[PDB]
């Protein structure tokens, strides 16, 4: 009751075809600044949705 | 004769003088809009689309808004379709109500059972639990023996194991119309029906001469 003969490398390619990670393109920008973020978090500059959320 | 849709308000016991206590299920019936009627080249038959709410006018798309424009776009809570045969007069010009049941006594309801998808052999397939003491090794929750040895070489179709439960269409037929109100658009029926309190019920009349 063990694997006998090796599975095909096309079948290995097809089982690996089900990937869903994205290249995140395009990234979103703030309504007052062209700085990039994912569609629901803050920028690393304190800008967010044209509101400004973290001071310096 | 077609069908109608309304919400399962709940169930309450109505009591009787000689017994039994009798549960009655209450159905809150909507203005079933009659958004469509199928006719020209539609497989030689006719069928009506009901619609059960107005949803939101902000959320609409042009392929839905044009397809419904013949009655205005509303398309809320569920569309649903019923076969129109032996109906004598055309359904368009008024929204259908509990007037469908003003003479009828019996109905069939497609309850749509509340989901219990997690299942299991004791929950779905009615099997026991095996030996909590005296001795048993990893065979305490099982549908017994799933197939006989050697000669079959394979597993049979239609075994009492796995799958999902609830969320079936589940019809019920042993019902009775207790009250109708065409002004309130309200229906009361005797007995219990599948589907949770606050879920939508499909009903059609049952007749035999």
């Amino acid at each position: 009751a063990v694997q006998q003969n090796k599975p095909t490398r096309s079948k290995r390619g097809m089982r690996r075809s089900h990937d869903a990670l994205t290249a995140v393109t395009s990234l979103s920008v703030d309504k007052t600044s062209g700085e990039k973020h994912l569609r629901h978090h803050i920028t690393a500059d304190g800008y967010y949705r044209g509101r400004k959320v973290i001071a310096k | 004769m077609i069908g109608l849709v309304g919400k399962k308000v709940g169930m309450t016991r109505i009591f009787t003088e000689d017994g039994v206590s009798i549960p009655v299920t209450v159905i809150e019936v909507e203005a079933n809009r009659v958004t469509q009627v199928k006719d020209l080249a539609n497989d030689g038959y006719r069928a009506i689309q009901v619609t059960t709410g107005a949803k939101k006018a902000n959320r609409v798309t042009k392929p839905e808004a044009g397809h419904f424009a013949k009655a205005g776009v509303e398309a809320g809570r569920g569309l649903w379709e019923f076969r129109l045969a032996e109906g004598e007069e055309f359904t368009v010009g008024q929204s259908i109500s509990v007037e469908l049941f003003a003479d009828v006594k019996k109905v069939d309801v497609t309850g749509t059972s509340k989901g219990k998808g997690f299942a299991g052999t004791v929950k779905r397939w009615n099997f026991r639990t095996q030996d909590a003491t005296h001795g048993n090794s990893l065979s305490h929750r099982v549908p017994g023996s799933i197939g006989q040895n050697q000669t079959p070489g394979k597993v049979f179709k239609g075994k009492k194991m796995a799958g999902q439960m609830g969320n079936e269409r589940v019809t019920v037929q042993s019902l009775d119309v207790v009250r109708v109100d065409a002004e309130r658009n309200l229906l009361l029926v005797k007995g219990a029906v599948p589907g949770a309190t606050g879920s939508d019920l499909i009903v059609k009349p049952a007749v035999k001469a």
Binding site: - | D18, G19, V20
Partner: protein, 122 residues
């Protein structure tokens, strides 16, 4: 609930505190007995003032349940003991002259009214 191998007190006059339920009857597979319906009993103690023998096999009917009588409205009428009364297997009818039980509506739904009605309790 009353079932196979249950020991009970008996509603028959000069009957002992101990009679054994050997079958719940109904011909089909059955879990528990039911009010106003028959059950198979053996006498586990006999009292000399009584009209039964120890170890004898007899027919009985359930006359009070701790589960109560409750079908028509769900309103329960309840009792503080489980008991049956003894029936003859050929001549029919309750074999005693007095019954110790509430003698409810489902017992007068049987052919027995003449020998149970000395003391109605509800």
């Amino acid at each position: 609930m009353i079932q196979e191998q249950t020991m009970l007190n008996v509603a028959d006059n000069s009957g002992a505190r101990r009679v054994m339920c050997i079958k719940v009857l109904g011909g089909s597979h059955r879990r528990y007995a039911g009010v106003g319906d028959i059950i198979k009993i053996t006498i586990k103690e006999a009292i000399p003032r009584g009209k039964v023998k120890k170890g004898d096999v007899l027919k009985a009917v359930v006359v009070r349940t701790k589960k109560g009588v409750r079908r028509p409205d769900g309103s329960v009428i309840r009792f503080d003991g489980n008991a049956c009364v003894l029936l003859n297997n050929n001549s029919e009818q309750p074999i005693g002259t007095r019954i110790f039980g509430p003698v409810t509506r489902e017992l007068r739904s049987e052919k027995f009214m003449k020998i149970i009605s000395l003391a109605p309790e509800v």
